[PDB]
Amino acid sequence: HVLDVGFLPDMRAAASLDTATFSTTEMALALNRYLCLAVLPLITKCAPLFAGTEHRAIMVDSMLHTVYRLSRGRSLTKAQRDVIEDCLMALCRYIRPSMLQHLLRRLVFDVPILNEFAKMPLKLLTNHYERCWKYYCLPTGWANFGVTSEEELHLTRKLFWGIFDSLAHKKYDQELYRMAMPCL
Amino acid sequence: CGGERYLDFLRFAVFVNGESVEENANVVVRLLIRKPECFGPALRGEGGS
Amino acid sequence: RLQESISDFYWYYSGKDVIEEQGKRNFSKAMSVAKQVFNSLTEYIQGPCTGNQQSLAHSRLWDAVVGFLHVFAHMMMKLAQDSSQIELLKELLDLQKDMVVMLLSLLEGNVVNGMIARQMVDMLVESSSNVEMILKFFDMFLKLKDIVGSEAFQDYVTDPRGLISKKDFQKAMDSQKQFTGPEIQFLLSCSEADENEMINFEEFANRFQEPARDIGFNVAVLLTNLSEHVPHDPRLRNFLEL
Amino acid sequence: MSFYAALIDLLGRCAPEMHLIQAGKGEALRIRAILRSLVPLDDLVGIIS
Amino acid sequence: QFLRTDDEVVLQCSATVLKEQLKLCLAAEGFGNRLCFLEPTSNAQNVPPDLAICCFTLEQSLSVRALQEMLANGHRTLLYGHAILLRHAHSRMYLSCLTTSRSMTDKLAFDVGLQEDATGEACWWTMHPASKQRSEGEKVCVGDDLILVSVSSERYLHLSTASGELQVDASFMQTLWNMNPICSCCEEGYVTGGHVLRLFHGHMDECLTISAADSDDQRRLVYYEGGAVCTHARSLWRLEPLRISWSGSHLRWGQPLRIRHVTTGRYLALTEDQGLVVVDACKAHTKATSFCFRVSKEKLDTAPKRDVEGMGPPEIKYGESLCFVQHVASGLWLTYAAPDPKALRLGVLKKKAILHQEGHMDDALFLTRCQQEESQAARMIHSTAGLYNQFIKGLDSFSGKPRGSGPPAGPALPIEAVILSLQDLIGYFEPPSEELQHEEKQSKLRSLRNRQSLFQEEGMLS
């Protein structure tokens, strides 16, 4: 069913300033994804699940046409509850925050995405056989979270508490030797 | 258009009360299957449908 | 139609052993209705209108009364195992009283072989199993006053106060004969357990022996009328010796 | 298509039971059996197509 | 009058196809096909219809609340609005509704059959009346048509005049279903239609027979024989009166009927001059095949025409009747021809039964009823042989015909029914359990040992 449907979520991403009338579809299938919340099959990542996860992420990001914040919460729970079906597979879905969301220092919408990304490190304790560039980039996530949230972004309580997390099953002496990283 | 003008009544019999009752539904579906012409006979006709 | 609905009501609760209070409450009015109806049908022909009787014999009344008896035997057997429904039990006995009264006044001292005893015989033997059930009910459970003062019941009364246990009734009525262990365990089902120390068997016999007397007299009157006004049916003779 | 849509929406809201008693019943599963004998799958997914 | 319980009943209905009404009964063999099929019966005067598989019988007629109660763990009269349990008297399989499709209806098709469905989920069928002149609660009568609906599928027992030929199911809608009292409570030591027995000439050990199979004579050659075939399948022959309803009435002296051989399913007659030939069941037009009974071979005026509807008068006792028969057409009486040379006489003792012009005064056929499973056995012989011969003939259709990638053969290949029948016979002839008590084990191994032997008196191996 998700193989047959998944291009229709792709069409659901079409929202910049142009569609504005097929919103009955948007709230219709806002109401026909809670079944996917109810279920956790599909471990082995055979199908293109990077596509479905990117559809979910860009759809919660897409506020340019009808969202109607209740369905935003519904779709957001849809993104959040998917962590109890994957086997650390969707590298496109784990790097897309690195390309979209972790770059965002809690601007508007990336704070729920940070709360959603907080679940995978809870697996990573004594787990998460690492990837090279992902494990190279996530300390940069830690660093901008621990500098920008200090002094570039505001110092609000609920703002800092939105993603006030460690995200580190880190090494002891060092972790990586990528290209020379004197400063970004 | 007539049947669509109908059956929102019968939907509203059972809709908001979530997972509605069987004392109503059993007689509903029983009377309905007993008169298959109430279906779309394009679908549930007396023969090829 | 009424008794048909009542039998459908019975088969529902037949899976259960205890009955809900509102169900019993509805059963009360449903029985009172048929009581009024039986009194009416008596008052048509109590005072013998013979055309009424001959029309009744060719009616569908027979099916109704046999279904009545079929529900009655199972229901009273189930009902008698608990104090909280003996009201319903005695009301059913009152309905049975009015029904047998109708059956008597249908005759009004009829002829020997006027087809009335014959149709009665047919519905009786067709209703054999339930006839046996109710007959077993009465011939068993009348004896709660039979065994009062009996020496082989008082042999095992292990109570100076006289508020005796349950198992005195167990021991002193299977050791003693003219009883049966099904009746024993059913009676102590009917008895007030009170952690197996007291029965208050005087009240136990006082509540239970009264209405059975009246209905047993009336049904014995029916059976004697039916035997005398027609011999020569051994199925009847079986029901006589029973 | 609106008529048949309201029909199937009714029949979904006229579900024979929910997870309460489909565990602990067969009569509602009889209703489910009559339903599934009437309508198959492999066309609803066609309706998605 | 009305169908009391624990009775024998048959279905009947009507359906015009050719602008001519046609009485369609229903039946099912059991073994080899769990499905049922129809049975035209209108042509009794020119061909006998099969009248064993259609016959079912009653077990219990109750309320649906009583049904729901007995699912959760006497003699009566049938009522409307009652569930009813049927039993196939031959195969002992209870009749139910099933979960299979046929005729491309693409629906709740539910091809009706029967099985061992003593579990009461689906073998029960809810009774209704057929019209507003009747109603619920009315004591049901004889001859009235009815509407009947499943318990599990809650669909009308449907007669499908589908896109193909006529067919039966419970798929769409109503059909008027009658209940002919085919039979009823018979009486002790008497005969009715459908019975089967051994037809003993003499006093001690001698009876009717036929030629043993694996013989080029076609087994149209009726004979007499002593005390060997008196425990075999050949000497069993079925009767049936020329009526349809109340066929299980008692048949009296001089009562008309046909006689079927149980194994071959063939009938007896004199066609033109060929003696007592065993005719098949197509050329059996109730004159050559119609026979009666006779107390003696004396001339009686033959004015017994007195129609009966009920059980009727019983007279005929087994071992004391000493019956005779005249062919209704020719009048000639059964007797051994007594044709035999010294070789055939000293050799195989075998007479030639023939409808003699007067006969001999020792025919006097006293009787021994067989009241046993072996009737069921012999019907299984007939069904199984009729399946296997046409199966192997369909095999021989293409035996000397290596096909190409094209139309592979001619007729169809009977495969599924024979497989079902094969595993059924396997379960039939299977041994008893070693864990059982000695006595019942001995009785049951005796029974199957008998049945092993009974599958050689009509071959069943070669």
Short mmCIF file of all heavy atoms in Angstrom, two decimals, chain E residues 420-450, unseen atoms left out:
data_model
loop_
_atom_site.label_atom_id
_atom_site.label_comp_id
_atom_site.label_asym_id
_atom_site.label_seq_id
_atom_site.Cartn_x
_atom_site.Cartn_y
_atom_site.Cartn_z
N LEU E 420 -10.64 -36.92 -3.85
CA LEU E 420 -11.47 -36.85 -2.66
C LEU E 420 -12.02 -38.22 -2.31
O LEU E 420 -11.97 -38.65 -1.15
CB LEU E 420 -12.61 -35.85 -2.91
CG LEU E 420 -13.66 -35.60 -1.82
CD1 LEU E 420 -13.00 -35.01 -0.60
CD2 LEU E 420 -14.76 -34.69 -2.31
N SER E 421 -12.51 -38.94 -3.31
CA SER E 421 -13.03 -40.28 -3.08
C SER E 421 -11.93 -41.23 -2.63
O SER E 421 -12.17 -42.11 -1.81
CB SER E 421 -13.68 -40.82 -4.35
OG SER E 421 -13.78 -42.23 -4.30
N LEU E 422 -10.72 -41.05 -3.15
CA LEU E 422 -9.63 -41.95 -2.81
C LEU E 422 -9.26 -41.81 -1.35
O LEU E 422 -9.17 -42.81 -0.62
CB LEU E 422 -8.43 -41.66 -3.69
CG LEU E 422 -8.47 -42.29 -5.07
CD1 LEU E 422 -7.60 -41.50 -6.02
CD2 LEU E 422 -8.02 -43.72 -4.99
N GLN E 423 -9.05 -40.58 -0.91
CA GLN E 423 -8.74 -40.38 0.50
C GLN E 423 -9.92 -40.74 1.39
O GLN E 423 -9.73 -41.20 2.53
CB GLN E 423 -8.28 -38.94 0.75
CG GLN E 423 -9.28 -37.87 0.43
CD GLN E 423 -8.65 -36.50 0.47
OE1 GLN E 423 -7.80 -36.17 -0.37
NE2 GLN E 423 -9.04 -35.68 1.44
N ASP E 424 -11.15 -40.62 0.88
CA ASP E 424 -12.30 -41.06 1.66
C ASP E 424 -12.32 -42.57 1.82
O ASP E 424 -12.58 -43.07 2.92
CB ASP E 424 -13.58 -40.58 0.99
CG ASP E 424 -13.83 -39.11 1.20
OD1 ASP E 424 -12.85 -38.38 1.48
OD2 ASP E 424 -14.99 -38.67 1.10
N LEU E 425 -12.03 -43.31 0.76
CA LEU E 425 -11.95 -44.76 0.87
C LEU E 425 -10.80 -45.19 1.76
O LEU E 425 -10.89 -46.21 2.44
CB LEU E 425 -11.77 -45.43 -0.50
CG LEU E 425 -12.96 -45.82 -1.38
CD1 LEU E 425 -13.89 -46.80 -0.68
CD2 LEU E 425 -13.72 -44.64 -1.90
N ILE E 426 -9.72 -44.42 1.74
CA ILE E 426 -8.59 -44.68 2.63
C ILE E 426 -9.04 -44.58 4.07
O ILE E 426 -8.81 -45.49 4.88
CB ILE E 426 -7.44 -43.71 2.32
CG1 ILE E 426 -6.78 -44.07 0.98
CG2 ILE E 426 -6.41 -43.66 3.46
CD1 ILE E 426 -5.76 -45.17 1.05
N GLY E 427 -9.70 -43.47 4.41
CA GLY E 427 -10.25 -43.33 5.74
C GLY E 427 -11.32 -44.35 6.07
O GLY E 427 -11.54 -44.66 7.25
N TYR E 428 -11.99 -44.88 5.05
CA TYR E 428 -13.03 -45.87 5.28
C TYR E 428 -12.43 -47.21 5.67
O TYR E 428 -12.81 -47.80 6.69
CB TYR E 428 -13.86 -46.02 4.01
CG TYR E 428 -15.00 -46.99 4.13
CD1 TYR E 428 -16.18 -46.63 4.75
CD2 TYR E 428 -14.90 -48.27 3.62
CE1 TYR E 428 -17.23 -47.51 4.86
CE2 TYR E 428 -15.94 -49.15 3.71
CZ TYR E 428 -17.10 -48.77 4.33
OH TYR E 428 -18.13 -49.66 4.43
N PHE E 429 -11.48 -47.70 4.88
CA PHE E 429 -10.90 -49.03 5.09
C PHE E 429 -9.76 -49.03 6.10
O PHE E 429 -9.13 -50.08 6.30
CB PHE E 429 -10.43 -49.60 3.74
CG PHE E 429 -11.42 -50.50 3.10
CD1 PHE E 429 -12.20 -50.06 2.04
CD2 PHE E 429 -11.58 -51.80 3.54
CE1 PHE E 429 -13.12 -50.90 1.45
CE2 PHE E 429 -12.49 -52.64 2.95
CZ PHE E 429 -13.26 -52.19 1.90
N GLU E 430 -9.49 -47.92 6.76
CA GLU E 430 -8.33 -47.83 7.63
C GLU E 430 -8.53 -48.69 8.88
O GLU E 430 -9.66 -48.92 9.31
CB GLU E 430 -8.07 -46.38 8.03
CG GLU E 430 -9.19 -45.72 8.86
CD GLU E 430 -9.01 -45.76 10.37
OE1 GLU E 430 -7.87 -45.82 10.86
OE2 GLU E 430 -10.04 -45.72 11.08
N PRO E 431 -7.45 -49.16 9.49
CA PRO E 431 -7.59 -50.12 10.57
C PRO E 431 -8.10 -49.45 11.83
O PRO E 431 -8.20 -48.23 11.89
CB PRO E 431 -6.16 -50.65 10.76
CG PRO E 431 -5.39 -50.10 9.65
CD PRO E 431 -6.02 -48.82 9.34
N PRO E 432 -8.41 -50.21 12.87
CA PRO E 432 -8.81 -49.60 14.13
C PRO E 432 -7.59 -49.14 14.91
O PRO E 432 -6.45 -49.34 14.50
CB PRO E 432 -9.53 -50.74 14.83
CG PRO E 432 -8.77 -51.92 14.41
CD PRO E 432 -8.36 -51.67 12.99
N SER E 433 -7.85 -48.51 16.05
CA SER E 433 -6.78 -48.03 16.91
C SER E 433 -6.27 -49.15 17.79
O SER E 433 -7.05 -49.92 18.35
CB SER E 433 -7.26 -46.87 17.78
OG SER E 433 -8.22 -47.31 18.72
N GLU E 434 -4.94 -49.23 17.90
CA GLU E 434 -4.34 -50.23 18.77
C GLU E 434 -4.67 -49.98 20.23
O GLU E 434 -4.74 -50.93 21.02
CB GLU E 434 -2.82 -50.24 18.56
CG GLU E 434 -2.36 -50.97 17.31
CD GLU E 434 -2.60 -50.17 16.04
OE1 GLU E 434 -3.45 -49.26 16.05
OE2 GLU E 434 -1.93 -50.46 15.02
N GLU E 435 -4.89 -48.73 20.62
CA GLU E 435 -5.16 -48.40 22.01
C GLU E 435 -6.55 -48.82 22.46
O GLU E 435 -6.81 -48.81 23.67
CB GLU E 435 -4.99 -46.90 22.23
N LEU E 436 -7.45 -49.18 21.55
CA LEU E 436 -8.80 -49.51 21.94
C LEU E 436 -8.84 -50.86 22.65
O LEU E 436 -7.93 -51.68 22.56
CB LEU E 436 -9.72 -49.52 20.72
CG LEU E 436 -11.22 -49.76 20.85
CD1 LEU E 436 -11.85 -48.69 21.72
CD2 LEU E 436 -11.86 -49.78 19.49
N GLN E 437 -9.92 -51.05 23.41
CA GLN E 437 -10.25 -52.32 24.03
C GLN E 437 -10.29 -53.44 22.99
O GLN E 437 -10.53 -53.22 21.80
CB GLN E 437 -11.60 -52.19 24.73
CG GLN E 437 -12.11 -53.41 25.49
CD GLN E 437 -11.12 -53.95 26.51
OE1 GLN E 437 -10.84 -55.14 26.53
NE2 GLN E 437 -10.59 -53.06 27.34
N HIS E 438 -10.05 -54.66 23.47
CA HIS E 438 -9.90 -55.81 22.59
C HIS E 438 -11.19 -56.13 21.84
O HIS E 438 -11.15 -56.46 20.65
CB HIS E 438 -9.46 -57.02 23.40
CG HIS E 438 -9.35 -58.27 22.59
ND1 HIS E 438 -9.87 -59.48 23.00
CD2 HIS E 438 -8.78 -58.51 21.39
CE1 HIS E 438 -9.63 -60.40 22.09
NE2 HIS E 438 -8.96 -59.84 21.10
N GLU E 439 -12.33 -56.02 22.52
CA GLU E 439 -13.58 -56.51 21.96
C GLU E 439 -14.02 -55.68 20.77
O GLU E 439 -14.35 -56.22 19.70
CB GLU E 439 -14.66 -56.48 23.04
CG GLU E 439 -14.55 -57.57 24.08
CD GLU E 439 -13.53 -57.25 25.15
OE1 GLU E 439 -12.49 -56.66 24.81
OE2 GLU E 439 -13.77 -57.60 26.32
N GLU E 440 -14.03 -54.37 20.93
CA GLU E 440 -14.45 -53.49 19.86
C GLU E 440 -13.45 -53.52 18.72
O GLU E 440 -13.84 -53.42 17.55
CB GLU E 440 -14.61 -52.07 20.37
CG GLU E 440 -15.78 -51.87 21.33
CD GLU E 440 -15.47 -52.28 22.76
OE1 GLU E 440 -14.43 -52.93 22.99
OE2 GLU E 440 -16.27 -51.94 23.66
N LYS E 441 -12.17 -53.69 19.05
CA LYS E 441 -11.15 -53.87 18.03
C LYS E 441 -11.44 -55.12 17.21
O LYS E 441 -11.34 -55.09 15.98
CB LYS E 441 -9.79 -53.97 18.70
CG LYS E 441 -8.61 -53.76 17.77
CD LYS E 441 -7.27 -54.10 18.43
CE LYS E 441 -7.00 -53.35 19.75
NZ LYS E 441 -7.29 -51.88 19.71
N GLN E 442 -11.83 -56.20 17.87
CA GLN E 442 -12.10 -57.44 17.16
C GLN E 442 -13.32 -57.31 16.28
O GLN E 442 -13.33 -57.76 15.13
CB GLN E 442 -12.28 -58.58 18.16
CG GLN E 442 -10.97 -59.08 18.77
CD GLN E 442 -10.05 -59.81 17.80
OE1 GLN E 442 -8.86 -59.50 17.73
NE2 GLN E 442 -10.59 -60.76 17.05
N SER E 443 -14.36 -56.66 16.80
CA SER E 443 -15.57 -56.46 16.01
C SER E 443 -15.29 -55.58 14.80
O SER E 443 -15.78 -55.84 13.69
CB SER E 443 -16.65 -55.83 16.88
OG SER E 443 -16.31 -54.49 17.18
N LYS E 444 -14.44 -54.57 14.97
CA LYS E 444 -14.22 -53.63 13.89
C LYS E 444 -13.28 -54.19 12.84
O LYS E 444 -13.47 -53.96 11.64
CB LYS E 444 -13.68 -52.33 14.45
CG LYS E 444 -14.75 -51.54 15.19
CD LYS E 444 -14.18 -50.40 16.01
CE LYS E 444 -13.37 -49.40 15.20
NZ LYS E 444 -14.01 -49.03 13.90
N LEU E 445 -12.27 -54.95 13.27
CA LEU E 445 -11.42 -55.59 12.28
C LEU E 445 -12.19 -56.68 11.56
O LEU E 445 -11.96 -56.90 10.37
CB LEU E 445 -10.14 -56.14 12.90
CG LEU E 445 -10.22 -57.20 13.98
CD1 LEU E 445 -10.18 -58.62 13.43
CD2 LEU E 445 -9.09 -57.02 14.98
N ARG E 446 -13.14 -57.32 12.23
CA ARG E 446 -14.04 -58.25 11.56
C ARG E 446 -14.86 -57.52 10.50
O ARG E 446 -15.04 -58.03 9.39
CB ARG E 446 -14.97 -58.89 12.58
CG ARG E 446 -15.86 -60.01 12.05
CD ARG E 446 -16.74 -60.55 13.15
NE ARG E 446 -15.96 -61.24 14.17
CZ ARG E 446 -16.34 -61.43 15.44
NH1 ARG E 446 -17.50 -60.99 15.91
NH2 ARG E 446 -15.52 -62.07 16.26
N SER E 447 -15.35 -56.34 10.84
CA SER E 447 -16.19 -55.59 9.92
C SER E 447 -15.42 -55.18 8.68
O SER E 447 -15.87 -55.38 7.55
CB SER E 447 -16.76 -54.36 10.62
OG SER E 447 -17.64 -53.66 9.78
N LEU E 448 -14.23 -54.62 8.87
CA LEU E 448 -13.45 -54.22 7.70
C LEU E 448 -12.92 -55.42 6.96
O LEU E 448 -12.66 -55.33 5.76
CB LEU E 448 -12.29 -53.31 8.08
CG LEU E 448 -11.21 -53.88 8.99
CD1 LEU E 448 -10.03 -54.54 8.26
CD2 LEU E 448 -10.75 -52.78 9.93
N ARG E 449 -12.70 -56.55 7.64
CA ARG E 449 -12.26 -57.75 6.94
C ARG E 449 -13.36 -58.25 6.03
O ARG E 449 -13.10 -58.65 4.88
CB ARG E 449 -11.89 -58.80 7.97
CG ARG E 449 -11.45 -60.12 7.40
CD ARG E 449 -10.72 -60.95 8.43
NE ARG E 449 -9.39 -60.42 8.74
CZ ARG E 449 -8.55 -60.91 9.65
NH1 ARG E 449 -8.86 -61.97 10.39
NH2 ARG E 449 -7.38 -60.32 9.82
N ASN E 450 -14.59 -58.22 6.52
CA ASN E 450 -15.75 -58.46 5.69
C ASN E 450 -15.77 -57.51 4.51
O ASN E 450 -15.83 -57.94 3.36
CB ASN E 450 -17.02 -58.31 6.51
CG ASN E 450 -18.23 -58.89 5.82
OD1 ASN E 450 -18.24 -60.06 5.46
ND2 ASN E 450 -19.25 -58.07 5.62
#
